[PDB]
Design an enzyme around this catalytic site. Sequence first.
Site, short mmCIF file in Angstrom:
data_model
loop_
_atom_site.label_atom_id
_atom_site.label_comp_id
_atom_site.label_asym_id
_atom_site.label_seq_id
_atom_site.Cartn_x
_atom_site.Cartn_y
_atom_site.Cartn_z
N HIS A 44 46.98 39.44 37.34
CA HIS A 44 45.65 39.92 37.48
C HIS A 44 44.57 38.93 37.86
O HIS A 44 44.93 37.77 37.64
CB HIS A 44 45.06 40.32 36.02
CG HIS A 44 46.10 41.22 35.38
ND1 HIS A 44 46.60 40.89 34.22
CD2 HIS A 44 46.65 42.39 35.89
CE1 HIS A 44 47.52 41.86 33.97
NE2 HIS A 44 47.54 42.72 34.92
N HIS A 46 41.60 37.01 36.56
CA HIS A 46 40.85 36.87 35.26
C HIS A 46 39.46 36.40 35.81
O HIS A 46 39.54 35.78 36.79
CB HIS A 46 41.42 36.04 34.22
CG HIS A 46 42.55 36.85 33.63
ND1 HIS A 46 42.51 37.01 32.22
CD2 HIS A 46 43.64 37.44 34.16
CE1 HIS A 46 43.60 37.74 31.97
NE2 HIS A 46 44.32 38.03 33.03
N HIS A 61 39.85 40.13 32.40
CA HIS A 61 40.11 40.63 33.68
C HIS A 61 38.67 40.75 34.33
O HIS A 61 37.81 41.05 33.57
CB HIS A 61 40.74 41.98 33.86
CG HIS A 61 42.15 41.84 33.45
ND1 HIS A 61 43.02 42.99 33.26
CD2 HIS A 61 42.86 40.79 33.22
CE1 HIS A 61 44.17 42.38 32.92
NE2 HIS A 61 44.10 41.06 32.90
N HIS A 69 41.33 49.20 32.04
CA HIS A 69 42.43 48.68 32.82
C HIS A 69 43.31 49.68 33.43
O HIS A 69 43.60 50.73 32.83
CB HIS A 69 43.40 47.92 31.86
CG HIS A 69 44.57 47.26 32.46
ND1 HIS A 69 44.48 46.14 33.24
CD2 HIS A 69 45.87 47.59 32.41
CE1 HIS A 69 45.78 45.85 33.64
NE2 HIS A 69 46.61 46.70 33.14
N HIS A 78 40.49 47.79 36.65
CA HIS A 78 39.56 46.56 36.67
C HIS A 78 39.53 45.98 38.14
O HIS A 78 40.61 46.31 38.73
CB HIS A 78 40.01 45.55 35.85
CG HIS A 78 40.02 45.89 34.35
ND1 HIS A 78 40.99 45.35 33.61
CD2 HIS A 78 39.21 46.59 33.64
CE1 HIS A 78 40.66 45.76 32.32
NE2 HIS A 78 39.62 46.51 32.38
N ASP A 81 42.94 44.03 38.59
CA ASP A 81 44.26 44.65 38.28
C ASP A 81 45.17 44.68 39.46
O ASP A 81 45.01 45.56 40.27
CB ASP A 81 44.08 46.07 37.69
CG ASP A 81 43.39 46.04 36.34
OD1 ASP A 81 43.33 45.18 35.51
OD2 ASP A 81 42.70 47.15 35.96
N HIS A 118 51.50 36.98 34.06
CA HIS A 118 51.77 37.18 32.59
C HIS A 118 53.21 37.30 32.18
O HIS A 118 54.19 37.58 32.79
CB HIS A 118 50.96 38.44 32.08
CG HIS A 118 49.51 38.40 32.05
ND1 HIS A 118 48.80 37.98 31.05
CD2 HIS A 118 48.56 38.73 32.94
CE1 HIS A 118 47.51 37.97 31.16
NE2 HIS A 118 47.32 38.45 32.37
N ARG A 141 49.65 34.43 28.89
CA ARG A 141 49.40 34.01 30.35
C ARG A 141 50.18 32.81 30.52
O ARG A 141 49.93 31.76 29.93
CB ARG A 141 47.90 33.90 30.38
CG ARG A 141 46.95 34.97 30.01
CD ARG A 141 45.54 34.27 29.81
NE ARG A 141 44.66 35.18 29.35
CZ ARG A 141 43.47 35.45 29.23
NH1 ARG A 141 42.59 34.46 29.75
NH2 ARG A 141 42.82 36.51 28.73
CU CU Z 1 45.76 39.55 32.93
ZN ZN Z 2 42.87 44.81 33.78
#
Ligand code: CU
Ligand code: ZN
Lengths: 151, 151
Positions: A44, A46, A61, A69, A78, A81, A118, A141
């Site tokens: 994602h 961040h 995010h 999300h 997001h 995403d 992740h 992460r």
């Molecule tokens: Cu993430």
């Molecule tokens: Zn998200």
Amino acid sequence: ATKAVAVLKGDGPVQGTIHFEAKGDTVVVTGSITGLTEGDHGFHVHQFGDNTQGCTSAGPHFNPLSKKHGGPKDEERHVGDLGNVTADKNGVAIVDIVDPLISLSGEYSIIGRTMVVHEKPDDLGRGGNEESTKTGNAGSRLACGVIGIAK
Amino acid sequence: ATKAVAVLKGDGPVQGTIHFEAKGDTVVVTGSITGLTEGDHGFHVHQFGDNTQGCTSAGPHFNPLSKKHGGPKDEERHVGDLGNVTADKNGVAIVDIVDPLISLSGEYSIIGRTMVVHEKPDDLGRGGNEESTKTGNAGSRLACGVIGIAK
Ligand SMILES: [Cu+2]
Ligand SMILES: [Zn+2]
Ligand SMILES: [Cu+2]
Ligand SMILES: [Zn+2]
């Protein structure tokens, strides 16, 4: 920018190079990740491009719209995403995504923010708990890196 | 941004953290570098925040105005010319500079570009050769890091 690149590193074995290119109103993301556990992984952007506390300081995010999300295909997601990246059994994830919500310029620009891979697969906000709605239950992460301008 | 930070690393022993803060029309740069050779070192913001080829891909000094290289006090200098940082005999450079040409926003913003600490002292464009006028004869880039937004 027109092209960007993120160099992912962690305190673990995971690593990779992600390239991004502006093609119209969309962003094409390509590149690879090695050192991964077989299967799916959340991927994602961040929100902060702060590596002062590793991957921890990249914050949440990136969601300028305060949405819940979701998956890269949901209207409700997001801005950062991008779902999952799949590793093969040698640990290689081949990232290939074309996404129309992220951007390399303007309001939703992701340049200077963090790309994170992740520990677990992303549930896409469809898991039935609060934590699914803010992070997909992707856990830990593993690797991250500030998105910068490239050639 | 209002505050930024650069994390310097190289394939050598040199390392450090540089903090930057917007105070009016100027930028205050603070932080330290250890692992250095005693004396003076060029310190400049290189134009690209590309670490794909280490410190080599950061390109030239950031000079949006196409000027010749100089010292932080010269009218004729590159936007990224911050002169020298001095190490003590234990190898520590204490960076303390207040500079009015660099910026954390707008045209001359240095966010997403590279901060590099060099092998030799900067001559400040006053050496008498072509190479002084583009880089100060600072030699080799020992450590560098993309400038990102901070708290
Ligand atoms: Cu993430
Ligand atoms: Zn998200
Ligand atoms: Cu330089
Ligand atoms: Zn210069």
